[PDB]
Symmetry: C2
Subunit: 311 residues, 2 copies
């Protein structure tokens, strides 16, 4: 008989294509078996790669020794992973962060340079030039200044934008006006032409993109949501767009995905819907970092990119 | 009586709003009079600011001592200005070049990250994720590597794009694969995911964006035209879009502007039309550089940003 692979991994991802891609990238390494959760051998896996995994993972696969979030963020992992003693790591990848920046830059430009108006006017064959707005005269606020948010803020500042940043904790970023804590929200919001959400989803940030926040922005601000769908209160977005409190939104993430065909966001002239595309670590990067960490673990070494479960 | 201003300027621009803006910025300086060509006193102006001026300017205003192109480019000036002995200068401005880059970056992103597909699918409420394409795996070609083109090429390379550049003359740009001359066109074109036109309009570049050029690109390339409308042969663009030789275009400039409501470009699903907005020097920058050069001239000094009429 064939001996079983030394490494067995369950790949528990909500997007089937993503899970399949990660399984294939892991199976490019000899002596590795990658299984989906429906396979009964999944119950025996010693390692897991996860993106919105089953909240019951630890029941279905009770022998797990290392769990990896298939992304830089961890707010898609269920509460049980945080409460267990299984080591939890994440994917930290230059190409992913660069992608999140690309998306934010497209979206900033769309509004600053009025591509939004151009595309709308194109539908009616209307030719209308608007004033040109220099990057120093477009004030962008980034909420959330961790690995991703801080990177984006710094890169925007490097292109010449006026950039403000907001975090729960102290941050110092060169070229960026940094604000800390809820009390500082009015001052962070009150000068912005554009707001970009990169917060993780927690009990405190749920619903933060709502009327109380939008009413502290200057009229005609734009919103860009790259966090989670639960950050948003949808009725409040649509209400802001209708009064002109918001002039537009670019939205990548929704409570349910695919976004249902009937959701009214799809149809608002001032909304751009993108299909949770802002950025994703590639399968091969995920595979390699997971395997490197498995190997470290098997050799008794300290793991890289360990998740602090109490942060 | 009031003595006439020491400085009298005619502002001959094809866009009335632009001419008006330049007149107002010049009139912010005391002892300056700025006139439109219809004013009979225009015939006496000693200085001119021009953007697609009357081909008869030198007849209507025969005492002109210094003529300024209200832009970095000069291909909108009529042949007579090049054949006369009147000094000719241009506007060189960091904010303008940065704007041309912004436009090119929006357009590169639009295609690389499939915002084009997202916006199209949004019209039908279709949710469709596509593969994510890293900047090093998006090969952008910039044709024209002068002040503007070279800047854009360098800035794109700095963001991590694979960047090629093409010029009539020798150029060396760090991080950019530089090609020279017509003979090198097949090699410059044959690897590109995206092509950006920044050429000036001359007898040799007229009609360069046509079938012979598009057929040397790899199928599914994208086009971005920031040069002049005459660079394009429209039928050939539409034909390329229809076979899939081109996957899309972003077009800022047209033989006639406003682009007529009936032009079929307005209606192609894979075309973006923008209203000659890519970038413009601001009125106050124009005004100040013109006045600085007038003052230099009146003091017998060498002028700045002099146009080489034989280049």
């Amino acid at each position: 008989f064939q001996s079983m692979s030394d490494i067995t991994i369950v790949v528990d991802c909500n997007d089937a294509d993503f899970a399949r891609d990660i399984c294939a990238a892991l199976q490019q390494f000899p002596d590795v078996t990658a299984l989906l959760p429906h396979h009964q051998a999944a119950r025996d896996a010693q390692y897991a790669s996860c993106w919105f995994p089953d909240p019951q993972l630890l029941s279905r696969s009770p022998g797990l020794k290392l769990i990896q979030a298939a992304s830089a963020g961890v707010d898609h992992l269920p509460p049980a992973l945080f409460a267990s003693e299984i080591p939890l790591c994440r994917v930290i990848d230059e190409d992913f962060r660069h992608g999140m920046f690309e998306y934010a830059l497209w979206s900033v430009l769309w509004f600053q340079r009025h591509f939004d108006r151009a595309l709308a006017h194109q539908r009616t064959q209307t030719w209308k030039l608007y004033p040109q707005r220099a990057a120093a005269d477009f004030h962008i606020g980034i909420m959330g200044l961790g690995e991703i948010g801080g990177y984006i803020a710094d890169q925007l500042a490097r292109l010449g934008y006026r950039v403000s940043g907001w975090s729960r904790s102290e941050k110092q970023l060169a070229g960026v006006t940094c604000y800390r804590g809820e009390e500082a929200l009015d001052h962070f919001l009150g000068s912005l032409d554009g707001l970009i959400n990169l917060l993780p989803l927690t009990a405190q940030t749920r619903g933060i993109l709502a009327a109380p926040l939008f009413n502290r922005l200057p009229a005609g601000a734009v919103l860009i949501n790259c966090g989670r769908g639960e950050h948003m209160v949808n009725d409040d977005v649509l209400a802001a767009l209708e009064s002109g409190q918001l002039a537009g939104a670019v939205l990548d993430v929704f409570p349910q995905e695919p976004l249902p065909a009937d959701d009214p966001l799809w149809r608002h002239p001032q909304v751009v819907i993108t299909p949770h595309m802002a950025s994703a670590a590639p399968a091969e990067v995920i595979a390699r970092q997971l395997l490197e960490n498995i190997q470290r673990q098997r050799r008794g070494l300290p793991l890289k990119n360990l998740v602090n479960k109490h942060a």
